[PDB]
Design a protein around this nucleic acid. Structure first.
Lengths: 70, 177, 94, 116
RNA sequence: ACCCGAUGCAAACUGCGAAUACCGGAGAAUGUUAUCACGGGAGACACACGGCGGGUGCUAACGUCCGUC
RNA sequence: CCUCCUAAAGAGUAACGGAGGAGCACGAAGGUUGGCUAAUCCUGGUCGGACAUCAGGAGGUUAGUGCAAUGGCAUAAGCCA
RNA sequence: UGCCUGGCGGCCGUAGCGCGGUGGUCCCACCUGACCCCAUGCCGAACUCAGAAGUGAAACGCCGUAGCGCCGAUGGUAGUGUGGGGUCUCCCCAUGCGAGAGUAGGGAACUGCCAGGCA
């Protein structure tokens, strides 16, 4: 079977445009933060233009990916 | 709430004397009466369970709730989602009247009455029964009964301990063990 | 009670520990309290000689370095899997 | 329980509306008193607030918690908000059913002049 | 059986977890732009050996093949 | 065609390498609004044998999540209306 | 401004579990009846309508309790990038990066806004 595409495409500190795919995942390893969508395949994309940011939020220590506008 | 005044008059007072409590509500109360009729052998047909539910509704003032199998197992040949048990969910004013009627007339008419089983406690003040021959109630006639069911009343009580549960049972008659 | 004499450490890293082990010594540490812990060297010969008794982990040992005597206690010792050579010792000021 | 149940019920809507970063209006109920306040997107700041506890609203209320009291709280918050210039903030029920004093507050706020 | 203290191990176990490598942002120095795109012309299209991290085998094997130099 | 490693913490990466499944189905098993949240053990009892529905405590997702498996799901993506 | 109570955020166990004490000034909670706004796949169960009649019992605010969870060093080791060496199956050397595991120590939170009561 051909290997699927996983991992993070855009990492922290990277400037991205609207609609840019950040991370491809099967489940939800990371959760959308600010200005980040979530497709049917649990794919995170940036709804605006700005820098990527990774953080931890929530009582269960869940990883969150957000976009900060410049 | 017919028995509510009588309870507040006698039970609260005498429990206060016995337990030197501070506040009025510290005395154990009645949370609910779990009129649950677990036939267990309902696999034969649904009509037996329907008749049990009808009898429960006639005894109470509301339609009973039907409980299905919690999970599917092979040893007990029980599947998942199969309606098996029936219960009555009473929480209001009819509870006092029903309990008064029971403690008045349903207690003496027990075959081979050798005392209620006082050693059945969950561990914090819940008292359960496992008796049979539910024909004690005269509200049901012999012309509408096909077998003998079982009464497994398990009183949900605010008692904080087995000692408090025993004290409340003694307060509500409970002749002996 | 035992007088333990050593040299003040000046190099931090695994190189110093390897050099001491080659030279028949080994590193140790003295901590306990809010004061800055001090890294120290131990001479295998004398330290093993004094530790041959069962009082090493029982009585309060004395480090006399640069003419200064300080009381310490032994908590745990790192022992080599098979080689009979001491590796590292932790000391608590008590 | 009750408080944990209410918090877990409300958190979904609260966070979902927080994703939009929109100023909200929240109402808290209690058989004795009713509270209402406007919350900015940050969550650490408020714009307007009104409660049944204060005499300014309890003077003309026979009982602190009632339908008339809820209506008075709603109209008072709607006023304070329109003088402040909230400009059509959203509303949150804080995990409370929309068939009682919450509905009364919402109706009063909508009818006072707000377009939310 | 249940079952407390764990020992002996796990490529198809990880409540912990590196070093490297890849990714993006800022900066001096340095390199004959050493970087990218288009167009013309290709050649090759059975590689060998050695170092390192590996798979499997009979804890022999140039066994039986991979990623990097 | 899909899942585990293989596969050396980005992606990709071979071997008569070894492990399993599928050719679907659903007009609900989808959308919306609201409500709810398990496996197991113990305590109690007549069929109950040690493990039938039932009352409670611990447990806090080891359940469930249609497909074999992997990763996710409390906001539940699970259940009812 | 000092104490007490409720709501809304940051922080996501130094914020946790168990034990004791304390709380009705205000507020919060227990709960009365419900044909009235409400609805039960049955239930005033949830939610909603009429309190001070009593209380802080259960829940919850605060203080202690280091039994316990958790955070957590310094130091040593493992491990590894570049070069070299050997008995090159594996290990050692100069240099750089070097932590979980165990201890020292910390640990019964803190912070921003609004609202009510006692001062």
């Amino acid at each position: 079977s051909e290997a699927k595409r996983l991992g993070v495409k855009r990492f922290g500190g990277e400037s991205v445009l609207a609609g840019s795919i950040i991370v491809r995942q099967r489940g939800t390893k990371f959760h959308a933060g600010a200005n980040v969508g979530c497709g049917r395949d649990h794919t995170l994309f940036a709804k605006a233009d700005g820098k990527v940011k990774f953080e931890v939020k929530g009582p269960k220590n869940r990883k969150f990916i957000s976009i900060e506008a410049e | 709430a017919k028995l509510h005044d009588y309870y507040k008059d006698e039970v609260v007072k005498k429990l206060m004397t016995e337990f030197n409590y501070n506040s009025v509500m510290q005395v154990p109360r009645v949370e609910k009466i779990t009129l649950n009729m677990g036939v267990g052998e309902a696999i034969a047909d649904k009509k037996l369970l329907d008749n049990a539910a009808a009898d429960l509704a006639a005894i109470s003032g509301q339609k009973p709730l039907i409980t299905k199998a919690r999970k599917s197992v092979a040893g007990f040949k029980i599947r998942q989602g199969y309606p098996i048990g029936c219960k009555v969910t009473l929480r209001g004013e009819r509870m006092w009247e029903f309990f008064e009627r029971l403690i008045t007339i349903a207690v003496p008419r027990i075959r081979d009455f050798r005392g209620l089983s006082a050693k059945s406690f969950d561990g914090r003040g819940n008292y359960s029964m496992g008796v049979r021959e539910q024909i004690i109630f005269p509200e049901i006639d012999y012309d509408k009964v096909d077998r003998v069911r079982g009464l497994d009343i398990t009183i949900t009580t605010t008692a904080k301990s087995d000692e408090e549960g025993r004290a409340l049972l003694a307060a509500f008659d409970f002749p002996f063990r | 009670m035992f007088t333990i004499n050593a040299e003040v450490r000046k190099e931090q890293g695994k190189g110093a520990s390897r050099r001491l082990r080659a030279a028949n010594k080994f590193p140790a540490i003295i901590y306990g309290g809010k004061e800055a812990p001090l890294a120290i060297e131990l001479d295998h010969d004398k330290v093993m000689n004094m530790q041959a008794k069962a009082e090493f982990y029982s009585e309060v040992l004395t480090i006399v370095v640069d003419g200064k005597e300080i009381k310490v206690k032994a908590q745990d010792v790192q022992r080599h899997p098979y080689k009979p050579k001491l590796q590292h010792i932790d000391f608590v000021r008590a | 329980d009750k408080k944990s149940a209410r918090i877990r019920r409300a958190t979904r809507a609260r966070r979902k509306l927080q994703e939009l970063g929109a100023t909200r209006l929240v109402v808290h109920r209690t058989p004795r008193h009713i509270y209402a306040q406007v919350i900015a997107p940050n969550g650490s700041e408020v714009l307007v607030a009104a409660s049944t506890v204060e005499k300014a609203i309890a003077e003309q209320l026979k009982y602190t918690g009632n339908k008339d009291a809820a209506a008075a709280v709603g109209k008072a918050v709607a006023e304070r908000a329109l003088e402040k210039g909230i400009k059509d903030v959203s509303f949150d029920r804080s995990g409370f059913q929309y068939h009682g004093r919450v509905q009364a507050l919402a109706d009063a706020a909508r009818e006072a002049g707000l377009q939310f």
